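ugh ok so i messed up the first submission bc i forgot one of the chains. this is the corrected input, ALL of the components this time, i swear. 770 residues overall. if the numbers dont match what u have on ur side tell me asap before i send this to the collaborators (the ones from the other lab, u know who)
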Amino acid sequence: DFESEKEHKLRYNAEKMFSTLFSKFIVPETIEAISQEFAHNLEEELYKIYTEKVRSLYSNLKDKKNLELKAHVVEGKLPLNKLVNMNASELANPDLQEFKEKRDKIILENFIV
Amino acid sequence: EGLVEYIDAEEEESILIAMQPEDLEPAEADVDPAKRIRVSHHA
Amino acid sequence: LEPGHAADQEQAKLIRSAIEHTTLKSVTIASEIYYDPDPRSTVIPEDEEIIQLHFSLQQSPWLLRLELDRAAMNDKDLTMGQVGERIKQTFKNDLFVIWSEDNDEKLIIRCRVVAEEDHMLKKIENTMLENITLRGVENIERVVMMK
Amino acid sequence: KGSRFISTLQVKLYGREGSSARTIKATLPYIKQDIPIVIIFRALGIIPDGEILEHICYDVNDWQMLEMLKPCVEDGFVIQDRETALDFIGKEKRIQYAKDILQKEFLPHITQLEGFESRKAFFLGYMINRLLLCALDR
Amino acid sequence: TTFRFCRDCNNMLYPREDKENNRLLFECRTCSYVEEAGSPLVYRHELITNIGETAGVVQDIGSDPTLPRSDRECPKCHSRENVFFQSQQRRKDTSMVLFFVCLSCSHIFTSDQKNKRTQ
Amino acid sequence: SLMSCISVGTDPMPIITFLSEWGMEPLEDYVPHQSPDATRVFVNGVWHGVHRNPARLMETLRTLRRKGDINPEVSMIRDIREKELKIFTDAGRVYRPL
Amino acid sequence: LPHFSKDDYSPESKGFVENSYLRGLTPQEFFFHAMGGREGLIDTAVKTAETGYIQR
Amino acid sequence: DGPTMREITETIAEAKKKVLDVTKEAQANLLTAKHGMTLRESFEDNVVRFLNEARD
Ligand SMILES: [Zn+2]
Ligand SMILES: [Zn+2]
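and heres the new structure output, hopefully the right one now
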């Protein structure tokens, strides 16, 4: 009975997360080259593993401000639902997208023997 | 007089020895082939 | 390797970390205990905002914060969410988890529980590292690849 | 040049690596039990914990060293003055047993006589120093 | 970690929680003395040990002829007359990394181009 | 070995006498935290007390051995990376000349 | 060896011989040859006896 | 034969250079430690390889 009372409470809490985020992604692409409507139409675009995929959508997208050189180069690169259920590894910071590949280049080298 | 010392094996832990009083002793400034290939005076 | 995929390089690349025994001991640098009497607010500044994220979207006065190594984690290829849900389903409903994600540089997993708890929380970290298996079958250690 | 009193002394560090209990104990020649170093120091005059703790740590700033002595205090926390420390051995009876064994069977090298409670218990502290140090890997 | 003792009897400090003011207090059971939680940190683990790299560092480190002298230029005094030793952390895992202790000023520095150790 | 010869041990007191006369802090009245760096001094593995300046006393002992005074079989060693002096006068040590 | 510098993982240091038996080994190149040969006398006595029980 | 005996101390010398390579690599922690191998072990295992590759 309180199922969709927790479900809509999340699909709208994620809209609230994307409300302050599409305001921080806007101000970064303005102070250096509404948003809540662009949020509830994208927080419903995913809407357990749901509190996990959301937990992941939270810190990975709200990646700012040096992490918003990879999250700003995604706000000005990625498509609508055609970038949505991506859950990318390198999705983090401009520097974190590469250091993750720097400890991976020896992770296969040390492994193969 | 102080021209020689008797060294116990635990005392050896802070001593530094040269193999020969000349072979490993001065400083560099022809070369014998069949002769042994030893290290150096470095220290 | 499984009948079909004989020369498949990537097949062994999955089975390897899926068979190799990973511990919380492997991925952890230091496990600390603080005194945070409030469930919501965290007196830790190195965690001050980390909470406000995985919170908004009754509970123990004794905090169990532990730092992780980014290379040692992204060695068996890991997520803080993986580690987080792993421990979550280990203790289950008696201990609740919060963490900083892979985006956040301060690699932390904060933990609490539900008279006397200084010794009882200090007791937990013992079983936590040694017994919490994270990846692969136990005993089966050094998984090395051969062509 | 007197017989060769082969009274070999053990100082053990109980509890594994997972078994947190880093209770430091020691095998007493004659008292058939591994007495925790806390009862020992207290049976030589060093009664307060922090004085006991200064005999081991030749510093003060090493938390890594003091967190291991930390449960060892709790080990003997119940016993305190020399009168109690000397009783947990083997009253009126073990009062003598312990007293003489400390002079005789315990660390006969340095002093066997009496009055070197200090010299012998300072040595015990050094024995645990290099003991915790090997577990610390330095 | 940082722990003190009783300012009356010198005994291990035992945590006791004032649940009325929700403050930690480190007290001596051996008496009734209590002090407050300066550092609300109770315990630090440190599975990955990074305090054991510069053990046995005396100014008199140059008075062990056994240790060989360096040629690297020091960052604050530029001395190419120093001395060096491999990590005094007896952990088998530890990489053979060098620490150059000066004799003209005793300003220790890493041979490292991976792990910078400024302490 | 041909060149090697084993000790029959000597007297520890002329060194007990010496160490104290050159600055041996009593073990009985040594402050472990006050004097941290104090280089620990042992005679045949027996701890007698500490000293404040090691390289100084260490230079003094070495002379007596090469003078004839501290018996020439006696072996004294200063550890820097630990701050210690396990002076040996022990019976049965194997010594080789250099 | 006490003839070496503290922390020497060098070729000759950890026991390598560059000379042939002809040329004649150095004092060091000879001592390192003693210890490695030492093992090859112990294991002889050991396994020749254990093997004896293994035949039985 | 004369120059072959000279060439031998060239083979041991080139591998002695292949020794300092790993020696310098290990000092600045640039060594890519293999799977199921300690960093201390990694250098030793490889330093032995070139010394014995050239010994042969
Ligand atoms: Zn008290
Ligand atoms: Zn300098």
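quick check: Chains H and F do not touch (no CB pair under 8 Å). that seems consistent at least. Helices of chain H lie at 2-27, 39-55.
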